[PDB]
């Protein structure tokens, strides 16, 4: 069971669009909060692409999390200096020991497959180095070959990931995304990887449609690609 | 869960690292570290309900308050779990934080891991202000810096 975010004429417009899709056991609607609950064995990426809909958190306590993924090192190839945010993970518990990850990447310099992992510790004082060991490796890559709306020589990607873990087990750990540098040579830091990460944080899971990140001010400093 | 850490940063000069340590699951939490780039004086210092910093104040929620209390100073009988009072910045703009707290915890219903730690521009009035907002947030003004409390060990 998952919850998705979307008047009275709007309602049947959507239920319509979904009907020929199998694996769906039921559909429930709350137009007040502008959400929709769907209990199924069917992929959420199926539900969303058919439709604009985002994965949202249920009301269940300690079921939703977020990780704002930022670069820690200064990279020669990375000239985006207005923000260090490169990615966003939205996490929802969708099972008893099942969890789903809405990952967006935007503004990375090198196209490529980026690899997501969860590290043991939520200590980002020293970037990846201080997060300790890999705790969960995600086999599926984030395919970042789409050009980014943030200009040329910048790339974006998106994917849903999954893990046999409850949300409460991820709280306080580090979510880390990285790729081997194409040119480790040009990087003085003796750094071999391009990494961005964030502490996995408790979240109410009431996210809006656009996947964005604001400064302490409130100004929007980053968003998922269109 | 015995050690936690937080990297405080913001849009300005204020930045810092705060450590948490709790030997016994129901022992006190030791809280220490440093915050620099502050103006001289007292600054509100507390933990929010969530650690979601995608939408600022909105996504992080009110003060961490599982017991549904009103806002207070840390020594007060009536206080949110997240209420850590004030940190003090010296003349060089540095607040050296050294706290023992009995209400926050690194486990159980009062567990603060995965929540936002925040330091504010103005002093927390410790709920002793003469308005309703005092009993909700302590009137500490705007957020200078924040971070998510993560597992350190
Ligand atoms: Zn309508
Ligand atoms: Zn409070």
Curated annotation (Swiss-Prot), chain A:
Encoding gene (name): CCS1
Protein name: Superoxide dismutase 1 copper chaperone
GO cellular component, one term: mitochondrion
Origin species: Saccharomyces cerevisiae (strain ATCC 204508 / S288c)
Residues of the HMA domain: 1-54
Location in or out of the cell: Cytoplasm; Mitochondrion intermembrane space
Alphabetical keyword list: Chaperone, Copper, Cytoplasm, Disulfide bond, Metal-binding, Mitochondrion, Zinc
Molecular functions (GO terms): copper ion binding; superoxide dismutase copper chaperone activity
CDD domains: HMA (cd00371)
PANTHER family according to UniProt: SUPEROXIDE DISMUTASE CU-ZN -RELATED
Family of this protein: Belongs to the CCS1 family.
Record keyword Heme present: no
Binding residue positions for Cu cation 2: 214, 216
UniProtKB/Swiss-Prot annotation, chain B:
Post-translational modification note: The ditryptophan cross-link at Trp-32 is responsible for the non-disulfide-linked homodimerization. Such modification might only occur in extreme conditions and additional experimental evidence is required. Palmitoylation helps nuclear targeting and decreases catalytic activity.
EC number assigned by the record: 1.15.1.1
Modified residues (N6-acetyllysine): 122, 136
CC annotations in GO: axon cytoplasm; cytoplasm; cytoplasmic vesicle; cytosol; dendrite cytoplasm; dense core granule; extracellular exosome; extracellular region
Pfam families: Sod_Cu
Binding residues for Zn(2+): 63, 71, 80, 83
Cofactor list: Cu cation; Zn(2+)
Compartment list: Cytoplasm; Nucleus
N6-succinyllysine modified-residue sites: 3, 9, 91, 122, 136
Keyword annotations of the record: Acetylation, Amyotrophic lateral sclerosis, Antioxidant, Copper, Cytoplasm, Disease variant, Disulfide bond, Lipoprotein, Metal-binding, Neurodegeneration, Nucleus, Oxidoreductase, Palmitate, Phosphoprotein, Ubl conjugation, Zinc
Disulfide feature: 57-146
Entry note: cofactor: Binds 1 copper ion per subunit.
Cross-linked sites for 1-(tryptophan-3-yl)-tryptophan (Trp-Trp) (interchain with W-33): 32
Matching PROSITE patterns: SOD_CU_ZN_1 (PS00087), SOD_CU_ZN_2 (PS00332)
Record-listed Cu cation binding positions: 46, 48, 63, 120
Modified residues (Phosphoserine): 98, 102, 105, 107
Catalysed reactions, semicolon-separated: 2 superoxide + 2 H(+) = H2O2 + O2
Effect noted on mutating residue 83 to A: Loss of zinc binding and enhanced tendency to form aggregates
Main location: cytoplasm
Modification type N-acetylalanine: residues: 1
Similarity comment: Belongs to the Cu-Zn superoxide dismutase family.
Assembly: Homodimer; non-disulfide-linked. Homodimerization may take place via the ditryptophan cross-link at Trp-32. Heterodimer with SOD1. The heterodimer CCS:SOD1 interacts with SLC31A1; this heterotrimer is Cu(1+)-mediated and its maintenance is regulated through SOD1 activation. Interacts with DAOA; the interaction is direct.
Other facts noted in the record for this chain: The protein (both wild-type and ALS1 variants) has a tendency to form fibrillar aggregates in the absence of the intramolecular disulfide bond or of bound zinc ions. These aggregates may have cytotoxic effects. Zinc binding promotes dimerization and stabilizes the native form.
Name recorded for this polypeptide: Superoxide dismutase [Cu-Zn]
Organism encoding this protein: Homo sapiens
């Amino acid at each position: 069971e998952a919850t998705y975010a979307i008047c009275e004429n709007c309602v049947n417009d959507i239920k319509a669009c979904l009907k020929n899709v199998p694996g769906i056991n039921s559909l429930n609607f709350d137009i007040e909060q502008q959400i929709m609950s769907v209990e199924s064995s069917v992929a959420p990426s199926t539900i969303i692409n058919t439709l604009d809909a985002i994965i949202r958190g249920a009301g269940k306590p300690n079921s939703s999390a977020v990780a704002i993924l930022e670069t820690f090192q200064k990279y020669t190839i990375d000239q985006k200096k207005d923000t260090a945010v490169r990615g966003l993970a939205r996490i929802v518990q969708v099972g008893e020991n099942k969890t789903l990850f809405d990952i967006t990447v935007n503004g990375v310099p090198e196209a490529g497959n980026y690899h997501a992992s969860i590290h043991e510790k939520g200590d980002v004082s020293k970037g990846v180095e201080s997060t300790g060991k890999v705790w969960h490796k995600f086999d599926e890559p984030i395919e970042c070959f789409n050009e980014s709306d943030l200009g040329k020589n910048l790339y974006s990607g998106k994917t849903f990931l999954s893990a046999p873990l409850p949300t409460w087990q991820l709280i306080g750990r580090s979510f880390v995304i990285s790729k081997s540098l194409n040119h480790p040579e040009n990087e003085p830091s003796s750094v071999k990887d391009y990494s961005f990460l964030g502490v996995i944080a408790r979240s109410a899971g009431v996210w809006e449609n656009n996947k964005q990140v604001c400064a302490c001010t409130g100004k929007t400093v980053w968003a998922a690609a269109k | 869960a015995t050690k936690a850490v937080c990297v405080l940063k913001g849009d300005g000069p204020v930045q810092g690292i705060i450590n948490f340590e709790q030997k016994e699951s129901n022992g006190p939490v030791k809280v220490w570290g440093s915050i620099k780039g502050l103006t001289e004086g007292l600054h509100g210092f507390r933990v929010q309900e969530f650690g979601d910093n995608t939408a600022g104040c909105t996504s992080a929620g009110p003060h961490f308050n599982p017991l549904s209390r009103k806002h207070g100073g840390p020594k007060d009988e009536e206080r949110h779990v997240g209420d850590l009072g004030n940190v003090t910045a010296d003349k060089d703009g540095v607040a050296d934080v050294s706290i023992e707290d009995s209400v926050i915890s690194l486990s159980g219903d009062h567990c603060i891991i995965g929540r936002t730690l925040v330091v504010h521009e103005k002093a927390d009035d410790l709920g002793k202000g003469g308005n309703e907002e005092s009993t909700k947030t302590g009137n500490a003004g705007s957020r200078l810096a924040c971070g998510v409390i993560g597992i350190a060990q």
